Amino acid sequence: SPADTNVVPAKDAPTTNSPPSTTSPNQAAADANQQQAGIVSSQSGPNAVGDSAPSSSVNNDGDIITRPTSDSIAAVANATKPAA
Numbered sequence: 001s002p003a004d005t006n007v008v009p010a011k012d013a014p015t016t017n018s019p020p021s022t023t024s025p026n027q028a029a030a031d032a033n034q035q036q037a038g039i040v041s042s043q044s045g046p047n048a049v050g051d052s053a054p055s056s057s058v059n060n061d062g063d064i065i066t067r068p069t070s071d072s073i074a075a076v077a078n079a080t081k082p083a084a
Helices: 025-036 069-078
Strands: none
Touching: none
């Protein structure tokens, strides 16, 4: 029974479920993933307490991004263009 014999991490899996948050990026994501898996809260006790998941917002550096790393470089760049 194929399409089962071979299952690999989905496209961009690290941070798929990760919800667009500005409060606790990781916690918020370690939860979308939590409910996502279907694992009820009351079921996993101590575990689902202090935990993080890669977040779709957190970006590669600590900083809690609010838009693509690229469109952010684009902001700084644009805001600096003396009249040719």
